[PDB]
Rosetta silent file (secondary structure, phi, psi, omega in degrees, C-alpha in Angstrom):
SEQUENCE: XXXXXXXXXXXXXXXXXXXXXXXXXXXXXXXXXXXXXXXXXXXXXXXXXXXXXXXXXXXXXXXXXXXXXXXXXXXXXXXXXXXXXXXXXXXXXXXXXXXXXXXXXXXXXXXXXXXXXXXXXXXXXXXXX
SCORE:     score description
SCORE:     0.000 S_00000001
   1 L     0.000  161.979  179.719    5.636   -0.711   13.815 S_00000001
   2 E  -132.415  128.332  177.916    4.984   -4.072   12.220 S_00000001
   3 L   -55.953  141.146  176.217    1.171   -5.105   12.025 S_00000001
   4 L  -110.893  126.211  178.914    0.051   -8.706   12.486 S_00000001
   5 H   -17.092  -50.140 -162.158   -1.921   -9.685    9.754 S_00000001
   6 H   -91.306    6.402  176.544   -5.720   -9.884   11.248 S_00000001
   7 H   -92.047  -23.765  173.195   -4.696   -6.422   13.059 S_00000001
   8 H   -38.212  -71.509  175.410   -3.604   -5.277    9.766 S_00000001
   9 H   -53.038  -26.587  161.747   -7.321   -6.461    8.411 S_00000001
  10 H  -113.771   42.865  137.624   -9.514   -4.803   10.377 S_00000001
  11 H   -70.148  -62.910 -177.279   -7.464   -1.395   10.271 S_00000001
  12 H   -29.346  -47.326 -173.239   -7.892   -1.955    6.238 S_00000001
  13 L   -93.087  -30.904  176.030  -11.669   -2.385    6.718 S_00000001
  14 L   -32.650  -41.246 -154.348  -12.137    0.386    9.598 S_00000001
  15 L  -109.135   44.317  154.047  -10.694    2.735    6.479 S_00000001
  16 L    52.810   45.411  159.188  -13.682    1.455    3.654 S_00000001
  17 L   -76.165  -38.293  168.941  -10.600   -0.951    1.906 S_00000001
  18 L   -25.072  120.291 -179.456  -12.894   -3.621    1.624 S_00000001
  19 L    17.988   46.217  168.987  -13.778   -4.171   -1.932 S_00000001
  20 L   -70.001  107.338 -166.892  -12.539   -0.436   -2.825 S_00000001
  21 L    70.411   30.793  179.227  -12.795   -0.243   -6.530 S_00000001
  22 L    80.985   19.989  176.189  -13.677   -3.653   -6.727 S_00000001
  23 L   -91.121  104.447 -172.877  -10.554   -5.104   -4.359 S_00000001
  24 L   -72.323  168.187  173.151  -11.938   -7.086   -1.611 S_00000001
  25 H   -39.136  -48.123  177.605   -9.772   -6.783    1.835 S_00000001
  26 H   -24.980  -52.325 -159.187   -7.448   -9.633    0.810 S_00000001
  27 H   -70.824 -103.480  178.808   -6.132   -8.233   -1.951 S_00000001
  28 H   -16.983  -23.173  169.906   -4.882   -5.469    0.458 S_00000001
  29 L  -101.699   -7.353  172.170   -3.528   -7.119    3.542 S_00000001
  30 L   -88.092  -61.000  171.141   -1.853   -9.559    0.523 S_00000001
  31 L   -38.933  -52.156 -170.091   -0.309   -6.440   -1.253 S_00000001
  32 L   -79.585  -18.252  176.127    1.043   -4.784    2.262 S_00000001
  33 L   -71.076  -50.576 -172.296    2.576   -8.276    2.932 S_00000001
  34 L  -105.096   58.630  149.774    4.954   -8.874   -0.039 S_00000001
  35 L  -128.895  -43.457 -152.691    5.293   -5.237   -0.297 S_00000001
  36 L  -121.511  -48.895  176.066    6.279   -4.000    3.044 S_00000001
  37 L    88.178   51.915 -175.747    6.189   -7.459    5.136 S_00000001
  38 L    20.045   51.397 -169.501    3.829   -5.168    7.450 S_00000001
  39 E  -116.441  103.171 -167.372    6.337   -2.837    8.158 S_00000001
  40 L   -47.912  -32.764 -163.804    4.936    0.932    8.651 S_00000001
  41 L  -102.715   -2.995  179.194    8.704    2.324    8.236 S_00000001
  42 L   -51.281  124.104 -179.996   10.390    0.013    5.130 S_00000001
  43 L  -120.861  161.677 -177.753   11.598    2.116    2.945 S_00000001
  44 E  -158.566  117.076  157.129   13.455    1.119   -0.720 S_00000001
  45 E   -86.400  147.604 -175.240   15.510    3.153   -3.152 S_00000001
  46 L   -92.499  131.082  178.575   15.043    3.371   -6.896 S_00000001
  47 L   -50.374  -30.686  177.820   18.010    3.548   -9.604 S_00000001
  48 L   -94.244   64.185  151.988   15.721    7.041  -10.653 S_00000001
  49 L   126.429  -78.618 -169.998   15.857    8.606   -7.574 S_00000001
  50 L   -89.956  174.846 -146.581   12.707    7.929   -5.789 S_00000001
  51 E  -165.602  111.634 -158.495   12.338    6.017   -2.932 S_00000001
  52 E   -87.934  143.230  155.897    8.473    3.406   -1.859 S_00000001
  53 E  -129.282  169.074 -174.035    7.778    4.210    1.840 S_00000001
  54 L    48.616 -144.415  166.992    5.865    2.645    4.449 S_00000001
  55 L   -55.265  -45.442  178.487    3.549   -0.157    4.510 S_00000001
  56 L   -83.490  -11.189  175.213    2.110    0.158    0.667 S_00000001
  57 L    57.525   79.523 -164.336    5.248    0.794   -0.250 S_00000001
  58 E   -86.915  150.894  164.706    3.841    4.163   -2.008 S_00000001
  59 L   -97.327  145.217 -169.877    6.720    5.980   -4.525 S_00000001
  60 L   -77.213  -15.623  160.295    8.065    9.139   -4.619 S_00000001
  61 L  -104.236   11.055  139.047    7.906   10.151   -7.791 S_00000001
  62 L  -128.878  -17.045  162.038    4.358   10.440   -8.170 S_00000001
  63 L   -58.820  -56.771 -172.458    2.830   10.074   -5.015 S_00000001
  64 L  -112.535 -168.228  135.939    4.456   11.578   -2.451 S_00000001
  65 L   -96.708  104.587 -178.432    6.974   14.770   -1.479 S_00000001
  66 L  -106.885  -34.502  167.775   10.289   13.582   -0.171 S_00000001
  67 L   101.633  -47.041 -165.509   11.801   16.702   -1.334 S_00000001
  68 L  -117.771   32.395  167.962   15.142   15.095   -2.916 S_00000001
  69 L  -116.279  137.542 -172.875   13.786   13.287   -6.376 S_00000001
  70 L   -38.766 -100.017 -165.330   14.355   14.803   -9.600 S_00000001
  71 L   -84.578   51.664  163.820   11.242   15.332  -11.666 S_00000001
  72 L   -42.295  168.814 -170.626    8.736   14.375   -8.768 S_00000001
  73 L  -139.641  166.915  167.777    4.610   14.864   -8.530 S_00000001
  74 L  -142.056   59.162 -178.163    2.427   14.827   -5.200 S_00000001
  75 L   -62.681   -3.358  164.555   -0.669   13.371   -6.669 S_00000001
  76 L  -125.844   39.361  173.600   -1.911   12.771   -3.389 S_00000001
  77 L     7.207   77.242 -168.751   -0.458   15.781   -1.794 S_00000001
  78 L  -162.315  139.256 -168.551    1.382   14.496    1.306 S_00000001
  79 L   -67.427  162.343  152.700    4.726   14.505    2.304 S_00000001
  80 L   -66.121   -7.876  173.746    6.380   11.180    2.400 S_00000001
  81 L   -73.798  -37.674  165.973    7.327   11.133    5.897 S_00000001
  82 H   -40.822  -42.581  175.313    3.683   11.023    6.709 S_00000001
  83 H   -73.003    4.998 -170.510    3.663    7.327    5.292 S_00000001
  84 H   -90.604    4.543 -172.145    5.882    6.503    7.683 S_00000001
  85 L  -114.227 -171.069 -161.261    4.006    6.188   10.792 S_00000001
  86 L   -71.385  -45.349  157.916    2.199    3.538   13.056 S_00000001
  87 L   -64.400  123.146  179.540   -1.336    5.429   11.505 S_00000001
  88 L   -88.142  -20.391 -175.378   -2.062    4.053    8.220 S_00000001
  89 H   -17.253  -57.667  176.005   -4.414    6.313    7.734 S_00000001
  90 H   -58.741  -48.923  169.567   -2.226    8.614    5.291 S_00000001
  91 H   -59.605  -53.735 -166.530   -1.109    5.657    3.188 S_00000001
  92 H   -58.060  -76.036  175.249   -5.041    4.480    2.950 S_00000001
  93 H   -23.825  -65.918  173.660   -5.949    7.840    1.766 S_00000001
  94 H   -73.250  -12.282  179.748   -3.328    7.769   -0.909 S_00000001
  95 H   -77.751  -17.300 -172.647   -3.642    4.310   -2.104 S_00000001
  96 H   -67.874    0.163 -164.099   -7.440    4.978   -2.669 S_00000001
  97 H  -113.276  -28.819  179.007   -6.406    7.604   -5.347 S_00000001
  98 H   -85.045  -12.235 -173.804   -3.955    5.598   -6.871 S_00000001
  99 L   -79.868   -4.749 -176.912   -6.046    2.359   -7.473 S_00000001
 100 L  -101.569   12.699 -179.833   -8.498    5.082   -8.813 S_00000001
 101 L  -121.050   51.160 -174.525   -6.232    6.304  -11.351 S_00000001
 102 L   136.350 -103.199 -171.259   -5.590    3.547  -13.988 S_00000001
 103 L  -107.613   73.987  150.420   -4.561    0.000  -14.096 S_00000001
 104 L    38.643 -136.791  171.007   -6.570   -1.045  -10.626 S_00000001
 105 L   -95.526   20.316  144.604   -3.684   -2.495   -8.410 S_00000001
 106 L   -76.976   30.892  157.748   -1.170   -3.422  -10.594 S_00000001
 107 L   -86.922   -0.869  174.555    0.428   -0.408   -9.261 S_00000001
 108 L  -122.852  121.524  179.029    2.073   -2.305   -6.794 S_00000001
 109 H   -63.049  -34.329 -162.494    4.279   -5.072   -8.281 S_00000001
 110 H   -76.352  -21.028  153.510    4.412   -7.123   -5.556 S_00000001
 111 H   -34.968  -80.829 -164.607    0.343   -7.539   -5.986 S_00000001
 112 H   -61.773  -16.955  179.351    0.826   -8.347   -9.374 S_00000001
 113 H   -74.499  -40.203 -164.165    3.701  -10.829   -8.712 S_00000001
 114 H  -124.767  -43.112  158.907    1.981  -12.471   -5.918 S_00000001
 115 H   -28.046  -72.373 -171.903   -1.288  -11.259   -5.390 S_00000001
 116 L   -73.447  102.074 -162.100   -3.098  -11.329   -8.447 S_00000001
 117 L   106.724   13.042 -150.760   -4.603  -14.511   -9.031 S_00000001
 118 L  -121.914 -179.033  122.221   -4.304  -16.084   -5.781 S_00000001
 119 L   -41.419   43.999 -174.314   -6.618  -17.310   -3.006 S_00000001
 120 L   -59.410  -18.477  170.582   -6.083  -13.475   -1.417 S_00000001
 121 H   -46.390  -38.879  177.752   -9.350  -14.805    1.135 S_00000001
 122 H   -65.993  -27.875  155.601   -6.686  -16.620    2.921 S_00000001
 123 H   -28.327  -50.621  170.301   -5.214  -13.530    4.246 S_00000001
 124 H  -141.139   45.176  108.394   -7.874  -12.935    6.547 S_00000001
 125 L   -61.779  139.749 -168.447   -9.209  -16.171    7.566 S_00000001
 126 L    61.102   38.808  145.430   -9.129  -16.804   11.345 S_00000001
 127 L  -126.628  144.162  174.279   -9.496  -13.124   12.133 S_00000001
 128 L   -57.334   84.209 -153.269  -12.168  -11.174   13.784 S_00000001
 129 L  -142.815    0.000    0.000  -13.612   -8.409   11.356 S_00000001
């Protein structure tokens, strides 16, 4: 399914996104836009392999289990098909582990391309949350 921004924004805060590691909501409903365009099923292949699903556009070769990428990991031990549905839950779950494992949210490029540095507040003005 594809989320309309302010429903997007209060899923994000229902699931404690809200300034998670020091990200306010923005930043997140900014990130799922120029990553996914708030599209639960967008998928993208990588010249190695792997392959970002869902909304967060999570990757397959450290995140998830897809089953057909060379040297994959399942640091957040969940198939990739999971990230694929209408419930973000399972993507929420795994992004909290990856912004908790290193360089904050420049694990998603399209953050750092677009994101990072921005008025991300504007995302969710003129929604109810």
């Amino acid at each position: 399914k594809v989320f309309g921004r302010c429903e997007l924004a209060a899923a994000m805060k229902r699931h404690g996104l809200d300034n998670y590691r020091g990200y306010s909501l923005g930043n997140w409903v900014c990130a799922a836009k120029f990553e996914s365009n708030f599209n639960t099923q967008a998928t993208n292949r990588n010249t190695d392999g792997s392959t970002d699903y869902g909304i967060l556009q999570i990757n397959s070769r450290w995140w998830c289990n897809d089953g057909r990428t060379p040297g994959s990991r399942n640091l957040c031990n969940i198939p990739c098909s999971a990230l694929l549905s209408s419930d973000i839950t399972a993507s929420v779950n795994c992004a909290k582990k990856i912004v908790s494992d290193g360089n904050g949210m420049n694990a998603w490029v399209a953050w750092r391309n677009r994101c990072k540095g921005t008025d991300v507040q504007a995302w969710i003005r003129g929604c109810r949350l």
